[PDB]
Amino acid sequence: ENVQEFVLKEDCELRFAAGDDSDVCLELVKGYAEIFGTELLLNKKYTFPAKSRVAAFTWKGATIELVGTTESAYVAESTPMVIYLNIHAAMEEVRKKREEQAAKAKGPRLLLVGPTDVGKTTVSRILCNYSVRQGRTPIFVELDVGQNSVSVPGTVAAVLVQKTADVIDGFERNQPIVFNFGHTSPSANLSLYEALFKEMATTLNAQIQENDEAKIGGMIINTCGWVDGEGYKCIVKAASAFEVDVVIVLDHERLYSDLSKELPEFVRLTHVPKSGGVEQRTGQIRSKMRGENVHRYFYGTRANNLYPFTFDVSFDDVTLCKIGHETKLVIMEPSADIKHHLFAFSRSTKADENVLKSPVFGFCLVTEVDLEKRTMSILCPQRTIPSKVLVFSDITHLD
Numbered sequence: 001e002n003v004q005e006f007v008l009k010e011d012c013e014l015r016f017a018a019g020d021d022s023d024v025c026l027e028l029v030k031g032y033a034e035i036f037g038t039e040l041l042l043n044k045k046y047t048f049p050a051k052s053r054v055a056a057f058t059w060k061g062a063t064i065e066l067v068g069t070t071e072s073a074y075v076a077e078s079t080p081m082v083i084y085l086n087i088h089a090a091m092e093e094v095r096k097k098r099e100e101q102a103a104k105a106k107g108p109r110l111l112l113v114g115p116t117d118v119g120k121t122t123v124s125r126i127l128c129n130y131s132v133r134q135g136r137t138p139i140f141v142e143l144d145v146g147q148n149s150v151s152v153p154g155t156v157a158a159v160l161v162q163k164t165a166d167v168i169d170g171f172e173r174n175q176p177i178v179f180n181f182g183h184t185s186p187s188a189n190l191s192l193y194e195a196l197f198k199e200m201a202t203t204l205n206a207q208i209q210e211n212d213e214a215k216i217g218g219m220i221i222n223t224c225g226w227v228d229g230e231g232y233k234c235i236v237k238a239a240s241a242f243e244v245d246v247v248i249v250l251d252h253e254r255l256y257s258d259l260s261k262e263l264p265e266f267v268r269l270t271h272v273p274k275s276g277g278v279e280q281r282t283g284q285i286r287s288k289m290r291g292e293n294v295h296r297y298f299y300g301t302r303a304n305n306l307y308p309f310t311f312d313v314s315f316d317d318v319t320l321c322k323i324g325h326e327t328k329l330v331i332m333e334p335s336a337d338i339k340h341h342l343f344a345f346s347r348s349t350k351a352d353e354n355v356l357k358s359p360v361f362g363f364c365l366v367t368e369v370d371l372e373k374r375t376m377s378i379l380c381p382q383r384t385i386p387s388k389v390l391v392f393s394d395i396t397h398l399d
């Protein structure tokens, strides 16, 4: 196996992309290092899959071995990483201020905005890990229905962070809160999109009243890339709904300029550049990655395999429905057209107006439709269905 050795000076990162067709393994052999905020263990081997784009950064100096074929691999000497540490430091300062003023203290809340392909998701992950290493437990909030890191696409979601992200797998998806939007773009149904992120904010505000540690943890919030026309108005509305203290704008000067003139004055607005390590993606790449996220939901990861169940469900044992004039519930008659679509298990026990704003237990995928036998085959994370009310998503997946 072909090997590449890299010496990283303090404040440098090894940026690499796995080949189109192979894994790459990483081992820290001396010193200290981290990947998007999680500390590496000395002499532990970390294995990454094809087309991964990764950076391993060190604060003190490290020597790192890479095993396998790479499409690119270089050490960058200039990064925005101190910018992110300082965003973390400022958040923890706000916690301690509010803790002594409450002797319960409420943690700070941060909104990340900008167009697609600027490193927005990655920055969210760094900030979450730094909070955990400090002894704190933050809440991560995901509003990108096109590229979601907590649940399936076409969702808005949130999760309590109690341990640093796994280097390969990201954050433990241990009991998230999840809502189904059912399209990849907010422009498909603008008024529904806005209604869902409002309900998310309301739900989280009630949860933290029962957990002092999560309350003081605070929130880190990832947005979609729609910044023009009606997308602009969407950004302003999310900032008010989550009562954010801080807005971080990545790489859009007209947007930063326009928002400085509209946001309330107490909101701290910071423009930051995108990392030189972020590459432009195309229409086909995002669509492809949506498929891969769906696969993970059911089957898990290499390190922690999930073992999903495939079983049949009678149409008499469930109710199928679709949202959307724009935000009305419509009951679906099973047809050949639902094949390949995701459906959410609503926490609502009936197919009501309450379906619209209820979170979900999780999802299934409709793999087959037998119109004559009146059954469908589904893929499901647990042995029996957690709910009888199934909600349509326009997201399709060929499994």
Ligand SMILES: Nc1ncnc2c1ncn2[C@@H]1O[C@H](COP(=O)(O)OP(=O)(O)O)[C@@H](O)[C@H]1O
Residues within 6 Å of the ligand: 015, 016, 052, 053, 054, 055, 115, 116, 117, 118, 119, 120, 121, 122, 123, 275, 277, 278, 279
């Ligand atoms: N410093 C970096 N070096 C190398 N790759 C990076 C770096 N930061 C982010 N990436 C990669 O670039 C891609 C795009 O980043 P992402 O955070 O998903 O962008 P956005 O959320 O703005 O669309 C991801 O594969 C991510 O892992």
Ligand SMILES: [Mg+2]
Residues within 6 Å of the ligand: 120, 121, 144, 147
């Ligand atoms: Mg993103």
